[PDB]
Amino acid sequence: NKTVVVTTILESPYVMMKKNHEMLEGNERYEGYCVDLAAEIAKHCGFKYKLTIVGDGKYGARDADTKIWNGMVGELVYGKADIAIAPLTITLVREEVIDFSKPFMSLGISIMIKKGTPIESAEDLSKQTEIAYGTLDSGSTKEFFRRSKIAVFDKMWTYMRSAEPSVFVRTTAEGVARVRKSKGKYAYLLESTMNEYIEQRKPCDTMKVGGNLDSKGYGIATPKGSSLRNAVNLAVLKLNEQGLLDKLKNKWWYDKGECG
Amino acid sequence: NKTVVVTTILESPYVMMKKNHEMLEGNERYEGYCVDLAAEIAKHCGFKYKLTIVGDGKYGARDADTKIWNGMVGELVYGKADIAIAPLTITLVREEVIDFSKPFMSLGISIMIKKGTPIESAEDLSKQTEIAYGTLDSGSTKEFFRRSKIAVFDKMWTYMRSAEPSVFVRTTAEGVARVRKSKGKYAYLLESTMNEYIEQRKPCDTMKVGGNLDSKGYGIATPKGSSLRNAVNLAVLKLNEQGLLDKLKNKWWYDKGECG
Ligand SMILES: O=S1(=O)CCN2C=CC=C(c3ccc(Oc4ccccc4)cc3)C2=N1
Ligand SMILES: N[C@@H](CCC(=O)O)C(=O)O
Ligand SMILES: N[C@@H](CCC(=O)O)C(=O)O
Ligand SMILES: [Zn+2]
Ligand SMILES: [Zn+2]
């Protein structure tokens, strides 16, 4: 019937530009876990689609004053895209305005350090001042810290919100670059999936420390009232049960390992 | 306003009879993770409820001949209960007939051995014959093997379906007892949640070995068209985000664990 507009985000190893992308067109420009997942979901649900990178480069949050959503969430809410296929965290505030499939991947918030940084846990970060730490802007990790009542995480947020210079970053790449360049004086709070990927990539100078802070999932999101909602949900379950999601995780994490 | 009928299952530590249950009435007869969760779901959704134990003691499968659903799934499908609050696995075949909330707990199929059994993986089990292995006789783990399109799990199914005497058990308790009494000659395939619980119980003679074979979740289930669906889903998200689900897992698994 109609070509489905898929909103997604450039985030390794979910969606990446191929090495030779400038000689390619349309969906062929991109590779990654979510590029493969989009192809599979489309096949099972019987639609044609166009991958479009989210304009503002954000996941999505609601401005507290204007109540306007940005990011991939806003693209669905305001009718700019038909579906989001991305590492988009299922959250309460989002589920109030968009629908999510059952989760296709598990994750938790985690800590990234430069190798040798004397930090082993969230408690460790909160007890010192020499090592700065932050999160991604406009995402679910930031919101976790803003909202937490757990003593350690409340203390961390109190520090983060007013720290100078700013500890928050615009992209994961910016957070990772900051860790790598700061000689051990910056630690980054990010999802375990992204942390684990980066740990197995050159220059192999980062690591995940401590347990995950929470347990949650990424889901495929559709605007409320979407005719795709049921089919997409069942397709996610079908792909998990046929072992394809596990295969894709091995393809884009384990097989892409550069650190041994 | 009507009292909501909750179907659940006697499975430790999700729902158990209190030691003084004969002297107690209604919901007060029961304790466990799902008893605590039901109380919270009901409070956040604004309903009164009655806990009922599934008549046939089963989770839910569709008979190949009659096409009749049994267990908790059957109780929802046939209108005998309004909601299931239990360790009920989200699956494609079930999602076609009932609705699940987002998961409240993560799990995968796992291997329970008697300590010192020379088994480390599902691969190991599939390559040998001295050590028998089986599953719960009417649940999602059995169906995982039966419907698998994965060669290694098809091999395991081909063995299990034809093993004599039967490798299948009626309850988790029966599976655990079989492991404990078989001197390392029976391994039990069960969900990681139950495996982890038993590992922390006297006489501390079992353990979980290897990685999980899959990744999925338990969900709170409602019959299609239920007016409870949205509120239940948002309640699960709220309770995960506020840290309650983690607290309840700690309470019932580890806090009073019997194996140090
Ligand atoms: O709905 S499923 O059965 C659909 C397929 N499946 C696949 C991969 C991963 C999951 C998962 C992700 C996140 C998840 O989140 C949690 C964790 C712990 C407490 C509450 C929520 C729980 C299961 C998953 N679930
Ligand atoms: N997956 C997150 C983005 C990453 C993060 O916040 O750490 C989201 O959906 O907002
Ligand atoms: N949680 C399973 C029961 C246990 C199992 O099959 O291992 C179900 O919902 O069917
Ligand atoms: Zn497929
Ligand atoms: Zn299909």
CATH number assigned to the domain comprising residue B191: 3.40.190.10
Under a CB-based contact definition with an 8 Å cutoff, are residues A59 and A139 in contact? yes
The pair of three-digit structure tokens given for residue A202, joined into one six-digit string = 């050159």
Spatial separation of the C-alpha atoms in residues A73 and B55, rounded to whole Å: 44
Q: How many residues does chain B have?
A: 260
By C-alpha distance, which of A193, A171, A214 is closest to A104?
A: A193
B108: contact with A, CB 8 A cutoff: no
Residue B26, Ramachandran bin (φ over 0: left; ψ between -120 and 50: alpha; else beta): left
Chain Cα centroid distance, residue B202: 21
Q: Are residues A142 and A164 in the same domain?
A: yes
Whether A11 and A91 map to the same domain: the answer is: yes
Classified as helix, coil or strand, A124 is: helix
- Contacts for A160 with CB less than 8 Å, ≥ 6 apart: A133, A134, A135, A145, A167, A168
- Dihedral angle sign, alpha carbons of residues B86, B90, B93, B97: positive
**B37 CB near ligand 1 (under 6 Å):** no
Q: Residue A51 CB: number of other CB atoms within 10 A?
A: 19
What is the β-pairing status of strands B186-191 and B109-114? antiparallel
Sign, CA torsion B53/B58/B64/B66 = negative
- Which residues have C-beta within 8 Å of that of residue A210, sequence separation ≥ 6? A110, A111, A120, A121, A122, A124
Find the DSSP H helices in A12-121. 33-45, 71-77, 92-95
Cβ–Cβ < 8 Å for B101, B44: no
Q: Please report, to the nearest 10 degrees, the dihedral formed by the alpha carbons of residues B235, A64, A150, B85 taken in order.
A: 10
* Dihedral of alpha carbons A149, A151, A153, A157, sign: positive
b/e B12-43 (16+ beta carbons within 10 angstroms → b):
bbbbbeeeeeeeeeebebbbbbbbbbbebbbe
Locate tokens 């980054």: which residue?
A188
Q: Are A87 and A143 in a shared domain? A: no
Ligand 4 centre and the CA of A42: distance in Å?
9
Tell me the HSE value of A181 on the side-chain side, using a 13 A CA sphere: 6
User: Cα–Cα distance between A190 and A107 in angstroms, integer?
Assistant: 10
Tokens of B10: 């006697």
Shared-domain flag, residues B196 and B223? no
Domain around A242: 1-107+217-256
Helices A33-45 and A229-241, packing angle to 10 deg: 120
The position carrying tokens 């670059």 is A177
Minimal CA separation from B84 to chain A, in Å: 18
Q: Which residues of A touch B234 (CB under 8 A)?
A: 92, 95-96
CA distance B121 to B131: 13
User: Is B215 within 8 Å of A102 when comparing Cβ atoms?
Assistant: no
Please report, in range form, the residues annotated as the binding site of A for L-glutamate: 87, 89, 94, 140-141, 191
Same structural domain, B115 and B237: no
Is B200 found in the same domain as B247? no
Closest residue by Cα to residue A222 from A85, A89, A105? A85
| Alpha carbons B141 and B151: distance in angstroms, whole number | 16
Task: Look at residue A12 and give its three-state secondary structure.
Answer: coil
Q: Are residues A209 and A179 in the same domain?
A: yes
- Cα separation, B38 vs B85, in Å, equals 6
Helix axes A151-162, A140-147, angle to 10 degrees: 110
Question: How large is the greatest C-alpha to C-alpha distance in chain B, in angstroms?
Answer: 58
Say which DSSP state B31 is in. E
DSSP-derived pairing of the beta strands B206-209 and B109-114: antiparallel
The residue length of chain A stands at 260
CA distance B8 to chain A (A): 22
Q: How far apart are CA B231 and CA A89, in angstroms?
A: 19
Helix (H) or strand (E) holding A247, with range, is helix A244-249
Distance in angstroms (rounded) separating the CA atoms of residues B83 and B104: 15
Residues B168 and B250 reside in one and the same domain:
no
Cβ atoms of A104 and A232 closer than 8 Å: no
B23 Cβ contact list (under 8 Å, min separation 6): none
Contact (Cβ atoms closer than 8 angstroms) between residue A100 and residue A228: no
Co-location of A103 and A230 in the same domain? yes
Q: Name which of B92, B237, B246 is nearest A234 (Cβ-Cβ).
A: B92
Q: Are A248 and A236 in contact (CB under 8 A)?
A: no
> Method used for this model?
X-ray
Site to probe by mutation for ligand 2, drawn from A9, A136, A147, A193 as the one with most ligand atoms within 8 Å of Cβ, is: A136
Residue minimizing CA distance to atom 3 of ligand 3: B139
> Does A84 share its domain with A122?
no
Cα-based distances in Å from A45 to A102, A212, A233, B54: 15, 34, 10, 35
Q: With an 8 Å Cβ cutoff, is A141 touching chain B? A: no
Separation between Cα atoms, residue A172 and residue A157, nearest integer Å: 19
Q: With an 8 Å Cβ cutoff, are B241 and A215 in contact? A: no
- Cα–Cα distances in angstroms (integers) from residue B169 to residues A22, A114, B176, in the given order: 59, 50, 10
- The count of structural domains within chain A is 2
Distance CA A33, CA A86 (A): 9
Contacts B91 to A, Cβ<8 Å: 237, 241
Whether B1 and B103 map to the same domain: the answer is yes
Residues B74 and B130 in one domain: no
Angle at A239 between CA A237 and CA A243, to 5 degrees: 115
Collect all residues with Cβ–Cβ distance below 8 Å to B251 and sequence separation of at least 6: B33, B36
Tokens describing residue B178 = 């079989």
- Of the candidates B211, B198, B213, B205, the one whose C-alpha atom is nearest the C-alpha of residue B257 is B198
